[PDB]
Design a binder for this molecule. Structure first.
Ligand SMILES: COC(=O)[C@@H]1C(=O)C(C)=C2O[C@@]3(C[C@]2(C)[C@H]1C)[C@@H](C)CC[C@H]1C(C)(C)OC(=O)CC[C@@]13C
Ligand SMILES: O=C(O)CCC(=O)C(=O)O
Ligand SMILES: [Fe+3]
Length: 277
């Protein structure tokens, strides 16, 4: 079940054969009598390798994720846990953009779609830890978001280095239960990827994310006891041919944490990233 540097748990995947017929969709809040989806989630046991002993070795080009030290003030953290929207869209966005610029050297970073999560929250499923394995954007979705956020400039930006990240930070520390797991992007096979339309509304309203199916080839990691000063950057899209075009991520129930541990709290923000290395 566990050893010094790994543990075992489960996550929700899609079937390897999902989406070979029609487009997959999942309704977030289906009405009575409405069909919720044309596929089922399937749990699979996964071995989670602790990234802690090799923390500084993981790289956004090689692995599709990286961990970076970046302390923020206790007051910004309490403002965020208080759902202070102005603190998120102002101070925290600025913090994330600046962090991403240190890490990559990018010329331009655009933050969007922040989600503050709390273990079995009341703000719905996007305010709760993610239980299905996903990559936030397909290429089409990343391209669409660049047009939507960057206007005219997109015609030039989309032809050089373009990346999209999820930037994830614990708001209570250390994280014990429901840690964010990330996969070595070199171990994702193209057939593991399944676009799924998340219907927040009656109709498709954006381009979709990828949901993953399980494979024994996938090498899954987690950073044990992650602190509020330790930020996970998880790559959802990259225009450059690098060993990991993307990673994928999801939370899992940790087998060795006490039942009565406090709820996990975190904030994640997506970012479009232009230029850099
Ligand atoms: C339990 O829900 C999760 O596990 C994930 C989640 O928590 C969130 C917040 C999501 O946002 C998505 C899809 C995921 C990754 C889901 C799978 C949808 C639901 C709304 C925002 C869009 C958007 C920003 C328009 O960009 C897109 O490319 C389309 C997909 C996302 C990123
Ligand atoms: O906090 C979680 O459980 C999921 C976070 C996430 O999906 C993201 O950062 O894109
Ligand atoms: Fe995500």
């Amino acid at each position: 079940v566990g050893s010094r540097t790994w543990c075992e748990s489960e996550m929700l995947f899609v079937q390897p054969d999902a989406g070979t017929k029609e487009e997959l969709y999942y309704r977030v809040t289906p009405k009575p009598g409405q069909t919720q989806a044309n596929f089922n989630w399937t749990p699979h046991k996964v071995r989670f390798h602790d990234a802690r002993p090799q923390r500084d070795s993981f790289d956004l080009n090689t692995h599709g994720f990286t961990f970076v030290e970046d302390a923020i003030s206790p007051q910004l953290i309490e403002r965020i846990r208080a759902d202070d929207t102005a603190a998120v869209e102002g101070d925290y966005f600025a913090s994330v953009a600046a962090l991403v610029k240190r890490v990559t050297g990018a010329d331009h970073v655009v933050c969007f779609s922040p989600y503050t999560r709390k273990e079995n929250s009341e703000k719905g499923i996007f305010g709760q830890p993610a239980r299905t394995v996903h990559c936030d954007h397909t290429p089409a979705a990343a391209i669409e978001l660049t047009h939507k956020l960057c206007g005219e400039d997109a015609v030039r930006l989309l032809q050089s280095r373009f990346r999209a990240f999820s930037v994830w930070r614990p708001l209570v520390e250390p994280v014990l239960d429901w840690p964010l797991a990330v996969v070595d992007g070199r171990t994702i096979a193209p057939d593991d990827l399944h676009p799924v339309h998340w219907l927040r509304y009656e109709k498709k309203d954006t381009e979709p994310p990828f949901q993953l199916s399980f494979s024994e080839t996938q090498k899954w990691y987690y950073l044990s006891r992650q602190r509020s000063d330790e930020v996970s950057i998880v790559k959802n899209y990259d225009s450059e041919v690098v060993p990991s075009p993307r990673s994928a991520h999801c939370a899992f129930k940790h087998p060795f944490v006490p039942k009565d541990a406090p709820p996990r709290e975190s904030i994640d923000v997506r970012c479009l990233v232009f230029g850099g290395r």
